[PDB]
Amino acid sequence: VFTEFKQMLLVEAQKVGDAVTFYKSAFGAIESGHSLHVLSSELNLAGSSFVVCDVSSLPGFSTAKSEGSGVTFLLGTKDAEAAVAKAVDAGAVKVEVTEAEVELGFKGKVTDPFGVTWIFAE
Amino acid sequence: HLVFTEFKQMLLVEAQKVGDAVTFYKSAFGAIESHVLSSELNLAGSSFVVCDVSSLPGFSTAKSEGSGVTFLLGTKDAEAAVAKAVDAGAVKVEVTEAEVELGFKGKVTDPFGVTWIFAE
């Protein structure tokens, strides 16, 4: 029996605060709690949650940010273009989406400052 | 106000591997199941979606060789959970002092490049 299942997003030493700021600004994530620079913070978003963790607290792990992580999330929204702009304003980088992507419902896409890829679907 | 209707956490896998990952997660963790080839899997009352990367245009690879993809599972017996996962094909990784201090008592890596931490 497993009692909880939560994704852990690993970020650079000392950067959990900046990530929390970013996720609140970009997506309206809410901090349910944290542990103290911040060592880890659990964020609630659109009915689920994830935990941001300082990789310096977890020796032997890697954020994989420099070569590209595979950390990928989908968010459902009524306006992908609006969500992309809100995310970019907070520091994300817009990734142009092609017709092949649009046909499958992938209407916007960003990479955030922590190497996460976010797909926006309408 | 900009609001989101859904938030899905996607595990990318190499071409043709979604079925193989599904059956692995069923054996290893008792995950239960339920164009893009994908399968939504449920553990501890929450879900993740396993996605064939070749079926996602605009994606280059699943990054299975060094992804940062990491999940935590709460359990009453991290030892037994680790053993069950290892019997299914996972690789046990000895936990660090740092991890023990956080309450993490077991850890494995799987054939899809994901690291699983067992929080007891």
How many whole angstroms separate alpha carbon A11 and alpha carbon A19? 8
What are the residues facing A117 on neighbouring strands?
A72, A111
What are the residues facing B119 on neighbouring strands?
B74, B104
Return the residue in A27, A72, A73 with the most chain B beta carbons within 10 A, the one to mutate for interface testing.
Answer: A72
How many whole angstroms separate alpha carbon A18 and alpha carbon A15? 5
What are the residues facing A6 on neighbouring strands?
B72
User: If you ran DSSP here, which 8-state letter would residue B89 be given?
Assistant: T
Number of domains in chain B: 1
Q: Over the range B81-105, which residues count as b (16 or more CB within 10 Å of their CB) and which as e?
A: bbebbeebebeebebbeebeebebb
| Residue in B with minimal Cα distance to A114 | B68
The CATH number of the domain where A60 resides is what? 3.10.180.10
| Residue numbers of the domain that contains B49 | 1-120
The answer, for A33 touching chain B at a CB cutoff of 8 Å, is no
